[PDB]
């Protein structure tokens, strides 16, 4: 019953500051424009100790599977090759990505009937809000 309140299919309903977050990460103009238009569904499931998170949109379909605390290599939707570790910290899923001496953190939390995603790169934060699909 690890992550039960996260499991399901979620749809993006609002975004703030995502273009600025992508700029801080190093995403180029064309990819920012198309990515910023995306309205993903996020699908989260658990089978034993393995968590799977899928993001599906017209921009890209991605999938990661992982065990908490156990690093993995990830190819991001913007084509970064990163080393990722995802942990649970006080009920929040915390996803750290490292690449080229840089780091970004993506936090997922349940708030009311929403799943709120905060993406942070240095001083720039983007908030993406999801509801059940
Ligand atoms: C649509 C989308 C695009 C991108 C991302 C996430 C999402 C998403 O909504 O999950 C990264 C987290 C890889 C950030 C860089 C730009 C590419």
From Swiss-Prot:
Keyword line: Acetylation, Cytoplasm, Lipid-binding, Nucleus, Phosphoprotein, Transport
Species of origin: Homo sapiens (Human)
Residues with PTM N-acetylcysteine: 3
Complexes and interactors: Monomer. Homodimer. Interacts with PPARG.
Keyword ATP-binding found: no
InterPro entries: Calycin, Fatty_acid-bd, ILBP, Lipocln_cytosolic_FA-bd_dom
Consequence of changing residue 24 to D: In a breast cancer sample; somatic mutation
Residue span of motif Nuclear localization signal: 23-33
Comment, domains: Forms a beta-barrel structure that accommodates hydrophobic ligands in its interior.
PROSITE patterns (UniProt xref): FABP (PS00214)
Localization of this protein: Cytoplasm; Nucleus
Family classification: Belongs to the calycin superfamily. Fatty-acid binding protein (FABP) family.
Phosphotyrosine, modified sites: 21
Protein name: Fatty acid-binding protein, adipocyte
Alphabetical GO biological process terms: brown fat cell differentiation; cellular response to lithium ion; cellular response to tumor necrosis factor; cholesterol homeostasis; fatty acid transport; long-chain fatty acid transport; negative regulation of DNA-templated transcription; positive regulation of cold-induced thermogenesis
Function: Lipid transport protein in adipocytes. Binds both long chain fatty acids and retinoic acid. Delivers long-chain fatty acids and retinoic acid to their cognate receptors in the nucleus.
Residues carrying Phosphoserine: 14
GO molecular function: fatty acid binding; hormone receptor binding; long-chain fatty acid binding; long-chain fatty acid transmembrane transporter activity
Residues the record lists as binding a fatty acid: 128-130
GO cellular component: cytoplasm; cytosol; extracellular exosome; lipid droplet; nucleus
Coiled coil: none
């Amino acid at each position: 019953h690890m992550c039960d309140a996260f499991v399901g299919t979620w749809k993006l309903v609002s975004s703030e500051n995502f273009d600025d977050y992508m700029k801080e990460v190093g995403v180029g103009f064309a990819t920012r424009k198309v990515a910023g238009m995306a309205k993903p569904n996020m699908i989260i499931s658990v089978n034993g100790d393995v968590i799977t998170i899928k993001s599906e949109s017209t921009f890209k379909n991605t999938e990661i599977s992982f065990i908490l605390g156990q690093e993995f290599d990830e190819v991001t939707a913007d084509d970064r090759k990163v080393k990722s570790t995802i942990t649970l910290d006080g009920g929040v899923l915390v996803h750290v990505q490292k690449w080229d001496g840089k780091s970004t953190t993506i936090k997922r939390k349940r708030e009311d009937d929403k799943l709120v995603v905060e993406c942070v790169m240095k001083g720039v934060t983007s908030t993406r809000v999801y509801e059940r699909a």
